[PDB]
Design a protein around this ligand. Structure first.
Ligand SMILES: CCCCCCCCCCCCCCCCCC(=O)OC[C@H](COP(=O)(O)OCCN)OC(=O)CCCCCCCCCCCCCCCCC
Ligand SMILES: NC(=O)C1=CN([C@@H]2O[C@H](COP(=O)(O)OP(=O)(O)OC[C@H]3O[C@@H](n4cnc5c(N)ncnc54)[C@H](OP(=O)(O)O)[C@@H]3O)[C@@H](O)[C@H]2O)C=CC1
Ligand SMILES: CCCCCCCCCCCC(=O)OC[C@H](COP(=O)(O)OCC[N+](C)(C)C)OC(=O)CCCCCCCCCCC
Ligand code: SF4
Ligand code: SF4
Ligand code: SF4
Ligand SMILES: [Zn+2]
Lengths: 147, 388, 177, 45, 137, 118, 123, 114, 355
């Protein structure tokens, strides 16, 4: 359990120290806890094939406060950090090319936030007048039932 | 200045087995930069799971890597069982192991014989898909679905094995080896196969770790790591199998690894068909699993529990877990968070193809375009898992 | 003498209940039969597999069910294709590509919607990224249900489209027009 | 004041910011049941 | 077996009429014993020869030229498919379902006027006022 | 039968197809729509279609009233809609019906009625 | 390593409004310079002046923001959109989300007072 | 495969509007409405399945305590229009009346295991 | 949210007594309450009209002849909005089935050529009369009939003669009918105007390229029909939808070749020869330029001043020169770049053959 300023040092320790040879990046994720002042919890999962052990590292972030990128240490973190940005909006400072990876090319919003609705804000159809695929507001023939 | 030319390998095209937009930049024949654009099969699985009970959420995992269904639901079941702190019975463990290796056979029959087809060998595809049909029949006999079984669930298995299935699985196993051998006669010692595979897609062990690769991609570089041996989960600690590991990090070594994995899966299936125990196939705690119907229709507690499990669901303790399996694609994992409720708070799937397609840029630089096809084929990329 | 009247018939049968009774009717019937037989016996869809329904398509190309026995060859480019089998979920990032592929197809062209995800959005109906049916993007001629629809079910859908084109009036409708 | 306007970066529609009203409430203890676990959480709807 | 002696031997077993019917319908020459017939008129056969492979032992001879698997009555749709070893011709009386209504077999009617028209079995939830007027007395 | 449409015109439907079921003319629940209301509100989708071939299953409210009353010696009747001809449960949960009162009494899953031998 | 794409910019959060000023003005310059490319790549049915008018509108939308970190996020997302537009990643369908004004008039009755909205149940 | 609503040998319909199939359905394909029948019985007035939402998982067939909703072995029901796949109560009951014998074979084989 | 831009209100009562309560915000899943029947929906204007009607949930009944020409209309709306019926004007039960349940009927039926089974009279007058008698028998609230411009009972052209006779029998049978008189409609996949100007190997005119008309965009005519459908102000009226600016065919061809950057070929050979060539080319089965069209080549647009116009519908049309770019750019070749001088010394810095 660490702070954002402490990501790069601790990860260097977890990568280079002889007793803690966590060399494989497994996953980078974020979790929204909107009751916390720092809403997003950025989670890291690491594996050591040397010692056959796993470790986890957690930091925190906001919609506007960034986190240091560990691409300088683990190249595999690139796509994961991109996904975390695309889904949650967490900005990773130091990232070479941080852009959406999963969502549509003009998607407005970060889906896995708890305030983002399941069905989103927009939908698509084919307009015969314009001869184009048009993005329009949402209307469902059957409304979602939460239960 | 070396001006580069941008070709879209194709949002719709044959080599991608699924839907991929690989924006490559070439200087002549050589790739210098690649930009795999994904999300064309992003369906919002990980947000939908947040609105579903743990039972309602399980068919999300059959549809992530859709050639290896039972292993995905196996890892989700393992995660939810680790949170629930329940023990699957021995028969359920043996069933899960046997069918996980049947699933591995199916995945490798798709992967090797689609890699072959994309490299140009058309005939192994059509040979292997009949064996796929023969195993799909066992899937259908146990679950009722050819592909999406929804069979391995949290707590074990949905239904016991029907009568006369082990005999037929043994009948298939008596002949599958010759099918493997006939595929190897075409591919293994062939000149053109070796030309298209030897010293293509080379990745070092250090970079294989740094990029997050696992499975054959990590074992071809020389690292002996397999989660079934290093962290056994269901019954792999009660069955004898060897792990293939290769040098030289090439695609030929990955192909040989996958064929050795075929043969070891067959070994495991033999042992499970010989040593299948008796007993229940799901946990005998009706607060987690449905009771039998003849008790639900005669016992009051059984019916109450049926009602609640099928309406509200079982409530999982609060916490979080990352657990993983040696899926046929590599290390597949699920990071679940429980809020004490019947529905997950967060479910992230660590798909093995995400990391591999991310490493495509490092692996395919300096190669010609015919070699990119082989690299995509040895990564064994299904895009439901890449995009989730 | 400028025309000021009309002996135009009433009670004239509609196409789907019109029986031939003249030599020209039988001649046009035979021409339509030949054209439709060719459209059936050469049935070339475009390779538009997006998701796990493509596994069943491939199994329909496998030895047990051999699509080639019925004349079926899957063609990479739409310019050589007559059918589009939408086999997989349609994401909002993929629908323009689907419509471009469809519009690149030469007429005659048909569309089969394979699977729940393509028919009505399916399992992912309530997502933020999925189209609630290729109906919204392209017009559909036959809907194959399932998740996945078995290889037999897709073959049944191919037979239903074969029946549709077998009952299609090409020259007879011109003779009506 | 000086509370940050995360609405500008949310990507959400502006109609939520200008037209809509939410309610913040604790779920009332049901008359049908003597349980109280659904309470103690502050719902936003 | 994909050999010529097979088709010659079967076409000697089933006469030339059956040969031309099978060539116009199935495309292959099959000889088997008649197991039964369904309510629609489709005849169902079973083979005992070693030449025929797994899943090619049971087959159908449709009655309509415009054949369709939907025309196969239930029970036979399961027997044809290797679900039950016993046909609904030879099933016991006690395994048969009891029906208090008349059995009506209707195949798929898609592409026809008999296609299913879906509708709402309910009426509107909110009933409106049928206006009636009163005078100010 | 001819049904007056909302635009003022007539919708001619035969009598066989205005029945709610072939074994019952009327509805068996308040919120259930009559076939006349169905046609009057959806005739645009019924127009060139064959009513011969649409689904018109038999109603159980009239078939369970044909089934005779069962009689028991006691205050309780036990019902389990079991098959007795194939394995497994295949019925509804076991239910005990009180029958002390004068009339007949039905199960809640099936509508099998029971009386106290009088 | 995994190298960046054509017009990528490393994410670097300014610690000053005066530096982010220059960054934003450079991004505005780049959008304006690339508008002809946006009209050629996407088969656009309207002027290059119209594209620049739209760019200016979207840059004016966030003109009176003063929180530095929000401005940093807006700059980062603007550069993301520039990279998505100049590299032909978007299609015409997504590019023309910015341009609803250029499509023909949406019907006759567009309320702007109370009674209109009332008769249409939008008040 | 294709869905069906079953009856008792009485002819009465098995379903009792408990809404467990509506509740467990991961795709929200089932839509149900019920009230008190004229003879005092708990029975449905609406039962709809959108096949274009359904995933053919069998959770409804597992959840039913009366063996009312089932899945037949049929796969040969493809259509030309999507409005034909919005199955309603009458369609499902007719399908059960059609497929009861196949369902009885399947039940006699399968019920002990579930 | 979406909006019902076509409706002024949400509770709408028809002239036949039906109460129509609009349901929703105005999207795909919304419903206006209205039912419509568009008789030429397969075609050029009808496709746009049905799209605009079904965008908001107006239940469109589409009578069709060829099953394959209509399929693109089912995409225009949700499930149950677009309904198809097989129709022939030689079958009265068909027309009654099509118009039974509707509040709005639109006749867009018309051919620019004569066929073996339908002369100009049989399609423009007798077909209109059959549809109009159905509309009168079923007391349909609104009937909106499209008659081509320059329609006149006795005229040089049989097309305009028959269109005027249709515009009379409609008005005599259905006095509450609205008659819309469109001018030459241009747009995408147009019938005989712009696609023809840009694809044809050679244009011909018996006259000079001198017939004058005000051309109008098909989408704006469809919009005007949409507004006429829901505006009950428009019963028993006539509309002349003609557009802002006047042009000759020569002016439009000059515009087309300035947009296209290619020289459109035209011939200008006499009348007695072209008319005979057209009369001969009616023997092939596919549509060709008809002899009555080269008759109409001498008949410029005479606008009726007593008839209503666009501005009565609060619509302002586009005109051809601003949309010609959008419409003709698919046929633009774009041969090469401009003035590759000043490219030499910058090109000298790049690598052109990799060693
Ligand atoms: C041994 C060998 C013996 C061979 C035997 C062969 C015998 C043939 C006898 C043919 C006699 C009957 C011909 C009837 C065919 C018409 C079929 C039909 O009814 O319609 C289908 C197709 C439709 O074309 P279309 O009118 O545009 O409709 C669009 C929506 N379906 O209709 C068609 O397919 C029409 C095809 C027309 C092709 C001509 C293409 C144009 C080439 C010249 C340029 C003229 C372009 C003008 C286009 C209009 C521009 C405004
Ligand atoms: N396009 C123009 O420039 C102008 C058009 N108009 C008029 O406006 C309307 C627009 O039509 P347009 O936009 O030109 O595109 P079309 O003229 O192609 O629309 C023609 C429609 O008429 C139908 N039709 C023709 N003959 C018959 C018939 N005998 N029986 C049944 N249906 C028939 C066609 O059906 P199918 O497709 O099955 O043949 C098609 O739906 C027509 O009334 C036309 O006369 C007036 C002035 C200019
Ligand atoms: C000879 C083939 C060319 C026929 C042709 O070309 O004849 C076509 C003509 C034209 O028909 P239309 O109504 O005027 O077309 C309408 C549209 N127009 C006005 C633009 C043309 O058909 C007839 O007049 C009636 C003759 C019917 C011929 C049917 C015999 C077909 C047998 C073919 C054997 C191989
Ligand atoms: S319908 Fe089912 S099998 Fe087909 S793509 Fe969707 S989830 Fe996969
Ligand atoms: S089996 Fe089909 S209808 Fe039943 S719950 Fe699953 S998806 Fe829904
Ligand atoms: S079908 Fe079964 S589970 Fe569904 S409401 Fe009826 S009785 Fe309950
Ligand atoms: Zn009972």
């Amino acid at each position: 359990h660490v702070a954002p300023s402490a990501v790069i040092p601790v990860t260097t320790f977890l990568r280079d120290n002889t007793s803690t040879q966590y060399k494989s990046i497994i996953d980078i994720t974020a979790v929204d806890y909107p009751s916390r002042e720092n809403r997003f919890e950025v989670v890291y999962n690491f594996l050591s094939v040397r010692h056959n052990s796993r470790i986890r590292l957690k930091t925190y972030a906001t919609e506007v406060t960034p986190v240091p990128s560990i691409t300088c240490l683990y190249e595999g973190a690139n796509w994961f950090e991109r996904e975390a940005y695309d889904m949650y909006g967490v900005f990773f400072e130091g990232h070479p090319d941080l852009r959406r990876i999963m969502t549509d090319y003009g998607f407005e919003g970060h889906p896995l936030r708890k305030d983002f609705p399941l069905t989103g804000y927009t939908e698509v159809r084919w307009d015969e007048e314009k001869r184009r695929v048009v993005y329009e507001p949402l209307e469902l023939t059957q409304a979602f039932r939460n239960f | 200045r070396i001006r580069a030319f941008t070709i879209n390998f194709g949002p719709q095209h044959p080599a991608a087995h699924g839907v991929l937009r690989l924006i490559l930049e070439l200087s002549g024949e050589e790739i210098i930069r690649s930009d795999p654009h994904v999300g064309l099969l992003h369906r919002g699985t990980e947000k939908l799971i947040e609105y579903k009970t743990y039972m309602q959420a399980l068919p999300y995992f059959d549809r992530l890597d859709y050639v290896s269904m039972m292993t995905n639901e196996q890892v989700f079941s393992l995660a939810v069982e680790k949170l629930l702190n329940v023990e699957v019975p021995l028969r359920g463990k043996y069933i899960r192991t046997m069918f996980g290796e049947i699933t591995r056979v199916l995945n490798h029959l798709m992967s090797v014989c689609s890699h072959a087809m994309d490299v140009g060998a058309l005939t192994p595809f059509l040979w292997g898909f009949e064996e796929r049909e023969k195993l799909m029949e066992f899937y259908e006999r146990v679950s009722g679905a050819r592909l999406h079984a929804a069979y391995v669930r949290p707590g074990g298995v949905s239904q016991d094995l029907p009568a006369g299935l082990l005999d037929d699985i043994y009948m298939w196993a008596t002949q599958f080896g010759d099918r493997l051998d006939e595929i190897e006669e075409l591919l293994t010692d062939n000149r053109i196969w070796k030309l298209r595979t030897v010293n293509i897609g080379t990745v070092t062990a250090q970079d294989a770790l740094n990029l997050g690769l696992s499975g054959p991609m990590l074992r071809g570089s020389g690292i002996p790591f397999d989660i079934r041996k290093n962290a056994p989960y269901d019954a792999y600690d009660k069955v004898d199998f060897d792990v293939p590991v290769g040098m030289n990090g090439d695609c030929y070594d990955r192909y040989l690894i996958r064929m050795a994995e075929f043969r070891q899966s067959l070994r495991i299936i033999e042992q499970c068909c010989n040593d299948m125990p008796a007993g229940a196939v799901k946990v005998e705690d009706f607060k987690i699993n449905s009771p039998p119907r003849n008790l639900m229709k005669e016992d009051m507690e059984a019916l109450i529990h049926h009602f609640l499990l099928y309406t509200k669901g079982y409530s999982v303790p609060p916490g979080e877990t990352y657990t993983a399996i040696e899926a046929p694609k590599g290390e597949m994992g699920v990071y679940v968070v429980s809020d004490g409720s019947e529905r997950p708070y967060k479910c992230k799937i660590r798909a093995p193809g995400f990391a591999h397609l991310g490493a495509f840029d490092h692996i395919a630089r300096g190669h010609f375009l015919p070699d990119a096809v082989a690299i995509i084929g040895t990564m064994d990329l299904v895009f439901g898992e890449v995009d989730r | 003498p400028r025309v000021s009247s009309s002996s135009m018939p009433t009670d004239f049968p509609l196409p789907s209940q019109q029986k031939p009774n003249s030599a020209v009717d039988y001649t046009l019937t035979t021409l339509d039969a030949v054209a439709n037989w060719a459209r059936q016996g050469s049935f070339w869809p475009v390779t538009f597999g997006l998701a796990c329904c493509a596994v069943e398509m491939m199994h329909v190309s496998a030895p047990r069910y051999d699509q080639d026995r019925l004349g079926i060859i899957f063609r990479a480019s739409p310019r050589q294709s007559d059918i589009m089998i939408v086999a997989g979920t349609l994401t909002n990032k993929m629908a323009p590509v689907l419509r471009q592929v469809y519009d690149q197809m030469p007429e005659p062209r048909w569309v089969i919607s394979m699977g729940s995800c393509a028919n009505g959005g399916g399992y992912y109906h309530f997502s933020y990224s999925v189209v609630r049916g290729c109906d919204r993007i392209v017009p559909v001629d036959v809907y194959v249900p399932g998740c996945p629809p078995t290889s037999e079910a897709l073959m049944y859908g191919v037979f239903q489209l074969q029946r549709k084109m077998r009952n299609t009036k090409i020259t007879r409708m011109w003779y009506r027009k | 004041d000086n509370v940050p306007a995360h609405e500008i970066v949310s990507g959400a529609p502006a109609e939520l910011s200008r037209n809509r009203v939410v309610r913040i409430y604790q779920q009332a203890k049901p008359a049908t049941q003597s349980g109280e676990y659904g309470t103690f959480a502050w719902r936003l709807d | 077996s994909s050999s010529l002696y097979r088709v010659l031997r079967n076409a000697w077993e089933v006469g030339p009429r059956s040969y031309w019917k099978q060539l116009n319908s199935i495309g292959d020459t099959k000889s088997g014993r008649l197991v039964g017939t369904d309510i629609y008129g489709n005849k169902f056969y079973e083979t005992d020869h070693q030449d025929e492979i797994h899943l090619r032992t049971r087959y159908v001879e449709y009655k309509e030229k415009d054949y369709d698997m939907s025309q196969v009555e239930p029970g036979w749709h399961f027997w044809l498919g290797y679900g039950v070893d016993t046909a609904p011709c030879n099933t016991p009386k006690e395994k048969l379902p009891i029906r208090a209504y008349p059995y009506k077999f209707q195949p798929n009617y898609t592409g026809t006027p008999g296609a299913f028209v879906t509708y709402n079995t309910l009426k509107p939830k909110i009933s409106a006022w049928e206006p009636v007027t009163k005078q100010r007395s | 039968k001819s049904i007056i449409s909302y635009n003022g015109n007539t919708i001619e439907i035969p009598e066989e197809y205005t029945k709610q079921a072939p074994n019952r003319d009327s509805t068996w629940a308040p919120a259930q729509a009559s076939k006349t209301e169905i046609y009057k509100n959806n005739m645009v989708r019924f127009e060139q279609k064959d009513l011969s071939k649409q689904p018109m299953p038999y109603a159980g409210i009239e078939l369970i009233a044909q089934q005779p009353v069962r009689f028991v010696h006691g205050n309780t009747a036990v019902c389990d809609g079991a098959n007795h001809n194939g394995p497994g449960a295949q019925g509804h949960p076991k239910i005990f019906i009180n029958v002390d009162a004068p009339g007949s009494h039905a199960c809640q899953y099936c509508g099998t009625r029971y009386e106290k031998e009088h | 390593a995994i190298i960046a794409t054509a017009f990528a910019e490393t994410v670097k959060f300014s610690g000053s409004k005066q530096e982010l000023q220059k960054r934003t003005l450079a991004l505005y310059r780049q959008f304006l310079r690339g508008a002809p490319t946006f009209a050629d790549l996407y088969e656009v049915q309207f002027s290059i002046p119209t594209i620049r008018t739209k760019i200016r509108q979207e840059f004016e939308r966030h003109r009176f923001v003063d929180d530095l970190s929000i401005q940093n996020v807006l700059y980062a997302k603007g550069h993301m959109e520039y990279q998505e537009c100049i590299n032909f990643w978007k299609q015409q369908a997504q590019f023309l989300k910015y341009f609803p004004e250029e499509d023909d008039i949406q019907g006759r009755h567009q309320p702007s007072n109370f009674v209109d909205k009332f008769l249409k149940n939008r008040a | 495969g294709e869905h069906a609503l079953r009856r008792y040998p009485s002819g009465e319909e098995r379903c009792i509007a408990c809404k467990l199939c509506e509740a467990i359905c991961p795709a929200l394909a089932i839509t149900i409405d019920a009230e008190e029948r004229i003879d005092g019985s708990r029975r449905t007035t609406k039962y709809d399945i959108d096949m274009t939402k359904c995933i053919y998982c069998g959770y409804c067939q597992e959840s039913c305590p009366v063996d009312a909703i089932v899945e037949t072995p049929n796969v040969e029901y493809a259509t030309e229009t999507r409005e034909e796949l919005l199955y309603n109560k009458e369609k499902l009951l007719a399908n059960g009346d059609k497929w009861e014998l196949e369902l009885q074979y399947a039940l006699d084989a399968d019920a002990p295991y579930r | 949210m979406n909006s019902f831009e076509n409706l002024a209100q949400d509770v709408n009562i028809t002239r036949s007594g039906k109460t129509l309560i609009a349901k929703g915000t105005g999207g795909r899943s919304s419903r206006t309450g209205y039912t419509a029947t568009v008789f030429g929906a397969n075609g050029f204007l009808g496709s746009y009209l049905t799209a605009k009607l079904a965008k908001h949930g107006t239940t469109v009944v589409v009578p069709y002849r060829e099953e394959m020409a209509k399929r693109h209309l089912k995409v225009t709306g949700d499930l149950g909005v677009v309904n198809f019926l097989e129709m022939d004007l030689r079958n009265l039960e068909s027309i009654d089935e099509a118009v039974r349940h509707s509040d709005i009927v639109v006749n867009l039926i018309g051919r620019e050529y004569e066929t073996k089974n339908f002369n100009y009279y049989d399609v423009h007058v007798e077909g209109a009369r059959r549809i109009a008698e159905a509309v009168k028998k079923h007391n349909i609230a609104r009937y909106i009939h499209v008659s081509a411009f320059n329609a006149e009972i006795d005229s040089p052209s049989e097309f305009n003669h028959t269109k005027g006779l249709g515009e009379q029998v409609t008005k005599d049978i259905v006095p509450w009918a609205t008659i819309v008189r469109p001018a030459p409609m241009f747009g995408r996949e147009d019938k005989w105007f712009l696609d023809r100007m840009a694809r044809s190997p050679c244009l011909v005119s018996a006259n000079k390229f001198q017939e004058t008309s005000n051309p109008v965009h098909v989408i704006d005519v469809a919009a005007a029909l949409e507004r006429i459908c829901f505006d009950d102000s428009t019963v028993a009226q006539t509309f002349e939808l003609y557009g802002p600016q006047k042009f000759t065919q020569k002016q439009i061809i000059d515009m087309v070749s300035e947009t296209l950057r290619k020289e459109v070929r035209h011939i200008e050979l006499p009348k007695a020869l072209y008319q005979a060539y057209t009369k001969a080319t009616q023997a092939i089965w596919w549509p060709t330029y008809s002899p009555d069209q080269v008759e109409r080549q001498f008949l410029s647009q005479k606008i009726d001043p007593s008839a209503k116009t666009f501005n009565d519908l609060d619509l302002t049309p586009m005109e051809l020169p601003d949309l010609m770019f959008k419409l003709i750019r698919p046929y633009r070749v774009n041969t090469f770049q401009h003035d590759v001088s000043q490219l030499e010394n910058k090109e000298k810095t790049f690598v052109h053959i990799l060693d």
